Design a protein around this ligand. Sequence first.
Ligand SMILES: [Cl-]
Lengths: 221, 208
Amino acid sequence: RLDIQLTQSPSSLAMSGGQKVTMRCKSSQSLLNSRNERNYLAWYQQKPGQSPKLLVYFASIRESGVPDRFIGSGSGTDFTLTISSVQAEDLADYFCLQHYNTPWTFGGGTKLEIKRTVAAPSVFIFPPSDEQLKSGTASVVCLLNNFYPREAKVQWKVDNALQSGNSQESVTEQDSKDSTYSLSSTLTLSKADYEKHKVYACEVTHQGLSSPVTKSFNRGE
Amino acid sequence: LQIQLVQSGPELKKPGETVKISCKASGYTFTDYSVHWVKQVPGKGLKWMGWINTETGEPTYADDFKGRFAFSLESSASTAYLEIHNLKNEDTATYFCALGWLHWGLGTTLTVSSASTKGPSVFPLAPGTAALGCLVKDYFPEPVTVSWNSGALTSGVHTFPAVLQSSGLYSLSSVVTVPSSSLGTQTYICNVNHKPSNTKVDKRVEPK
Ligand SMILES: [Cl-]
């Protein structure tokens, strides 16, 4: 009975399609059983929204129905998962598991994504509908479409006043075809507030934009 | 006959309540393998909860799972249970029973919330490419499904992961990009399905 730390690195990873990917899992205690010469370490893949899937067990043995581009290696305290040629479907979180001592422990995971060329988002702003306004609320939606990489800043301005605490963001998983992301920001205001001001704008800052882009609308056009 | 673990269905509970989840096993001698339990919290890692010996019936818990958690058995039914007492929002997670690192169940989803079941309201996001969409607001619990034009329109469609509002209700939008030249000729309908409330909405989204 012994607390074992597993440390996985790096924490997140972006490789170009077809290239090699390497990720590490180091244990605070040797996972090598001298009795049978097996390392009690397993790797799992977990895709966005799915249950975990065993990739290799006892450190190096590939599980059936696992593509041979996946290779587990290492011994004792140092283990490596290699993906020889990364594919779009490999978008996932990768966890190592030690089952040498109780309690069993997972590492913190490595997030893998595909790197592609930089792509500026397409920005769209959507005013509240008349139908929603009838119920005393007004949601303003800003859409950032098909961009890479993931990092982006969105800020709302009502009458050129910067907004804070009233919007929420959501981001799609990496597209399996063009390897991009999309993002929504939703600004929420009472019908009251919404009638008060005239100018609604969202300002988008992204590495693919030579300068921050802005879409905006005036209430009642 | 391959090993099979059948886990009970999605669970919706309120704070303070109790939930008992089942794991039904076949394809092997039940008392040959111990049953492990694993908690997966959404957008976070995996936590091993402990295990139960299927011969002895003795449960062993991981430190973070002592007190409110109990493993148990009905051996004559080759079944294992996880019971959680005095539920908290943070018990919200998927739970997997497993025969160690090797054979896992599909998992059981648990949502703990004081919110009550509610169907969404569907609002239009009116639009050489144009964007348009549907705002699917104030529903509970997850999930909702969205399609466009009965499923015939898939390319260019983004349905965003839902966000949890302060009200405790979820909200999401679904968007699609289409040729601007088509706004006058092609009708766009988003089909929204929220099964928990038995709510099915078709919403025409037109330019204004
Ligand atoms: Cl046993």
